[PDB]
Design a protein around this ligand. Structure first.
Ligand SMILES: Nc1ncnc2c1ncn2[C@@H]1O[C@H](COP(=O)(O)OP(=O)(O)OP(=O)(O)O)[C@@H](O)[C@H]1O
Ligand SMILES: Nc1ncnc2c1ncn2[C@@H]1O[C@H](COP(=O)(O)OP(=O)(O)OP(=O)(O)O)[C@@H](O)[C@H]1O
Ligand SMILES: Nc1ncnc2c1ncn2[C@@H]1O[C@H](COP(=O)(O)OP(=O)(O)OP(=O)(O)O)[C@@H](O)[C@H]1O
Ligand SMILES: Nc1ncnc2c1ncn2[C@@H]1O[C@H](COP(=O)(O)OP(=O)(O)OP(=O)(O)O)[C@@H](O)[C@H]1O
Lengths: 31, 534, 40, 514, 83
């Protein structure tokens, strides 16, 4: 139960990192 | 009302707890009897604490659950042992708060007309421990205690919660909490009596009498008298064992499990099964009062002359004097006589003839190899125990063997002598009485130590002196024929004899090992050899 | 032989690391959609 | 506001306010120190808070800080010390702003022993000690704490200059407790729920070791009993429902409720002396009068003496002559502020060291008074003695010999009485010289005294008395009083006709001569 | 009709080498019920606070569930405590 919630939080953090990387790449291309 | 219409003394099946139940009801529900007007007019607070404690097998859980059933309100909450403690941090406080949250919310919503809620705590001592007396490992225990203390009575006060807890070691509970407002009423539960035993046995035997499964030979009063010091659990176990023994009489085993299927309705329980179960299956656990008299009296008592009767009358007179007097609450006597004269047996018989509530015997047999200080502690504990009851009799046998006396030097123990001298004139508390009977075989030694003067009086216990006593003893034993008796008389009448009863019994039993032709001569030779005495 | 064994109480699960982590990520969806539209 | 501590109040005044009146300049130049350490301990109640508030109010200081138990402690770490720095931040700001003459800050602790006495405890203690006294100087810190275990405090707080004041809390009195009962029962008095036949004066007078908790508990028990009077329970949950209009509680019910519900918690002591006197004292002759007169003379000499502050006497006589009772009666008649009795009964199985410690403790306790009397009975049993050997304990004898020639602090008196039945033994041990003098207690000598004692007892009628006198008058007798009572009781068992013969036979058998 | 309750406790003791663990095994095998549970000494203790109690409680879960579901007419669950 709690371990699943922690895994979901870690996956959300990974998704946030991926979103930040995509943002950086997209802005770099837009420049 | 708040009380269910089905309430009734019989329906709960409780035993001899009339006074305890009455006190509980009076001091925990009286305020709930009058309507709101009068209680508001008084403007007094309510009770918020109840704690039941006592030895195992008393009925604390039964009483608690019966009280919970009687109350007519929301289902009471129950905590089944110390399951509140959890590993992820902060969960004990979460659970303890979640326990009272429903009551808090309901009372807040309903204002001043909220219903009554009670929580049942089991094994309270597990969770709460003395904060000061505890290790410094981690505080999953101090935090829980503090949270519970805050919840029960903190900044915000509530009047719809009653704490009930059952424990077996009251001293382990924290003292800082058991104060008025949290736990004020505290009762002590002991052991029932013959009346309570009878009532409990009737409660458990109701169904059989309803269906007439008990033969007419059953006597509840006799059974209650027979079982002494038992408890409710022990009585239930005895009844169940008797039922099982009676039921087993229609089972064939060791080849194939079979039953009649036709004689099953002819089952009945008799008394003999009850005694068999009582003597073989059940045995008392809470202490005991079985002052074994067969061990001390291994052959009964036989009247072989006046001295036995005189001793018995003197003992009865002394007992009557101590029972029916107040100016001398303490009285003691000393029994003395030559070796092998049955002093201990006579003392035990005299003690048993009395009907004092508490009778105990202290003998060196139990203290084998004990140190020089353990004996004093044991005697002090025994005398403290004997102080509680109103009447009590204590028998001290083999005094000479209780001091380690030896005629070389001579050697003995001073501490035990001083303890015994002090304990032999300390008057008991007010409104009580005590009796002390002592035994010994050396009057001169006690006189030298200046201890015989402490005793109020002494009684002499002589031994066989004349032949006619020997013939009477032989006739009572009935271990010889007329011809042998006449032959023995024709010799014993020649002169006098001097032999103790125990030695006489040993001599006759040793002589009985030879062939009939030589038994008489061997007995005479043994008596002559052992008869060298004044 | 004066010595004593010890008992443990884990904390690797914090019930307060789920509020901020979830609320934090919930706002980047609009930004990602806006930037995708802008790039298109 | 507070009684019994006027001189103690002056002492506290000198200890605390002596160094504060002077301007900071002169004291700083001289280098004098300041008193900033106070600790309290005593029975729970309002006395501690009352004393703390009385001390705080006089000083022209701001609102003091009070904490109820371990409030600083929390589920997590860092909360305990979070408040400590916040509280003293204002004190530091005031010190840095106003300089030496800064507004005083007062701190009051309740049950600080919970936090001060396993890193939480020692960390909190270290933080508190650093805040109270450390590298940074705080001239406006006052600390007061109340705990029931003052001796368990850490050693650090015991360093000189940190704990300079030792004081003890008072106890409830008759008038104060009467006021407490009055405030509690004002509600009932206004509502007329208390019967006019109840007197609170004697009820408060007789109370011993009762605190507010005990008072409210017994009051609640009385209310419950009053509620039950109308109730008809123990048979059903139904009552009359009509008598409720008229209700009152007699003092008898108050006593019944409060005498079988609660009991004092903080110990219970009494001066019961009847245990040593089971049948009083009967004047059966002249010698008792002489003994009482000698005792009174010794008591008046000890009270009025100036050169000999210590006086001792020894009671001597044959066994079963009634020595302990006479000593106890004399001690009771002395009417001194402090009286104690040391008997071997309390010490059964104790070794020599335990007996010596108990004797030393009892004598130390008796010393602290202004004048007292101590009685020792059964000296031989006190220092175990046996004719064989002979054998005895030398340590107890040496302790007794030392204590029998030690004077008390100047300005105080003391009296010592000893009873024994073996003069020769004590003389051989060289102890009889220490005692100032000795007294004798004879037994019944002439049959006339025996007849007088029997008549005073009133156990036999004239017909039997005449025969007894005729049979015994023509001979001398030697019997002990206790043995005489025992024999009388034993003879009383039989029928009224055979009493005389059995009694005479028993007396003849017991007869003896010196 | 008799309204009696069955016994739920047996204890065996004696010096080493007489047949206690044989008797227990034979009793467990005799009954036509579910396979008995077995505990080998202090195997239930654990390191993390509040895990031993959970292990003990897990033993009786099946019996309580069966009692709740099938009421009185329920099977028999055997638990064998070793040492
Ligand atoms: N006075 C009594 N009246 C009726 N039954 C009693 C009485 N005393 C004991 N018993 C019996 O005791 C049995 C168990 O009672 P209970 O569960 O309260 O024991 P307990 O005191 O809680 O034990 P423990 O103290 O070890 O927890 C019941 O079956 C009940 O019949
Ligand atoms: N009338 C009697 N009086 C005493 N003992 C009797 C009498 N009749 C039979 N006996 C037997 O005498 C036996 C003597 O018991 P026991 O060995 O305790 O005697 P004792 O005199 O107290 O002991 P001892 O003298 O050996 O220290 C008793 O077991 C009893 O069976
Ligand atoms: N005038 C009296 N003088 C002394 N004792 C008296 C007198 N009148 C009555 N008594 C009774 O004598 C009893 C003797 O008490 P106690 O046993 O202390 O005597 P004791 O002679 O000091 O003791 P012991 O014989 O152990 O040395 C007292 O209980 C008291 O009731
Ligand atoms: N009455 C018996 N009949 C046959 N074998 C027996 C008997 N009693 C013991 N044994 C033997 O015991 C062996 C198993 O050991 P067992 O279970 O008796 O020891 P235990 O009583 O458990 O010992 P421990 O006290 O160490 O636990 C088997 O090999 C079996 O042959």
């Amino acid at each position: 139960e709690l371990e699943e919630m922690q895994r979901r939080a870690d996956q959300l953090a990974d998704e946030s990192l991926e979103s930040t990387r995509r943002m950086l790449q997209l802005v770099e291309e837009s420049k | 009302s708040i009380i269910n219409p089905d309430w009734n003394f019989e329906k709960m099946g409780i035993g001899g707890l009339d006074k305890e139940f009455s006190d509980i009801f009076r001091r925990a529900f009286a305020s709930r009897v009058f309507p709101p007007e009068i209680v508001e007019q008084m403007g007094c607070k309510h009770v918020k604490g109840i704690l039941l404690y006592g030895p195992p097998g008393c009925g604390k859980t039964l009483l608690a659950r019966q009280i919970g059933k009687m109350l007519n309100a929301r289902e009471p909450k129950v905590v089944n042992g110390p399951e509140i403690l959890n590993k992820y941090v902060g969960e004990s406080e979460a659970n303890i708060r979640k326990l009272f949250a429903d009551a808090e919310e309901e009372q807040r919503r309903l204002g001043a007309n909220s219903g009554l809620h009670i929580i049942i705590f089991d094994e309270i001592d597990a969770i709460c421990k003395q904060r000061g007396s505890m290790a410094g490992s981690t505080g999953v225990h101090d935090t829980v205690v503090n949270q519970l203390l805050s919840k029960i009575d903190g900044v915000e006060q509530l009047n719809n919660i009653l704490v009930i807890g059952m424990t077996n070691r009251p001293d382990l509970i924290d003292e800082a909490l058991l104060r008025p407002g949290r736990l004020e009423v505290k009762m002590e539960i002991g052991l029932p009596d013959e009346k309570g035993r009878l009532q409990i046995l009737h409660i458990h035997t109701a169904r059989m009498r309803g269906h007439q499964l008990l033969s007419a030979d059953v006597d509840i009063k006799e059974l209650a008298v027979e079982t002494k010091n038992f408890s409710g659990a022990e009585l239930e176990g005895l009844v169940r064992a008797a039922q099982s023994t009676a039921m087993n009489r229609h089972i064939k085993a060791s080849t194939k499990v079979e039953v009649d299927m036709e004689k099953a309705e002819s089952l009945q329980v008799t008394r003999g099964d009850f005694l068999a179960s009582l003597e073989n299956d059940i045995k008392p656990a809470f202490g005991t009062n079985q002052e074994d008299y067969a061990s001390y009296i291994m052959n009964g008592i036989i009247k072989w002359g006046d001295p036995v009767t005189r001793v018995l009358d003197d003992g009865e007179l002394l007992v009557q004097q101590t029972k029916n007097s107040d100016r001398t609450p303490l009285v003691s006597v000393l029994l003395e006589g030559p070796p092998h004269s049955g002093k201990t047996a006579l003392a035990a018989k005299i003690a048993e003839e009395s009907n004092f509530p508490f009778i105990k015997i202290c003998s060196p047999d139990k203290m084998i190899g004990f140190s020089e200080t353990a004996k004093c502690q044991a005697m002090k504990k025994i005398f403290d125990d004997a102080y509680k009851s109103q009447l009590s009799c204590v028998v001290v046998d083999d005094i000479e063997r209780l001091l380690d006396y030896v005629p070389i030097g001579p050697r003995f123990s001073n501490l035990v002598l001083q303890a015994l001298l002090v304990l032999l004139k300390k008057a008991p508390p007010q409104g009580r009485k005590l009796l002390i009977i002592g035994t010994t075989s050396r009057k001169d030694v006690l006189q030298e130590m200046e201890m015989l003067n402490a005793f109020s009086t002494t009684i002499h216990v002589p031994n066989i002196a004349t032949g006619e006593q020997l013939l009477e003893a032989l006739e009572l034993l009935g271990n010889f024929k007329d011809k042998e008796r006449t032959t023995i008389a024709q010799q014993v009448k020649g002169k006098k004899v001097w032999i103790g009863i125990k030695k006489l019994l040993m001599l006759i039993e040793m002589s009985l090992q030879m062939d009939p032709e030589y038994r008489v001569r061997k007995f005479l030779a043994l008596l002559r050899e052992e008869g060298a005495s004044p | 032989a004066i010595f004593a064994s010890g008992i443990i109480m884990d904390s690797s699960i914090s019930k307060q690391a789920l509020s901020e982590i979830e609320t934090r990520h919930s706002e980047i969806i609009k930004l990602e959609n806006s930037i995708r539209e802008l790039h298109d």
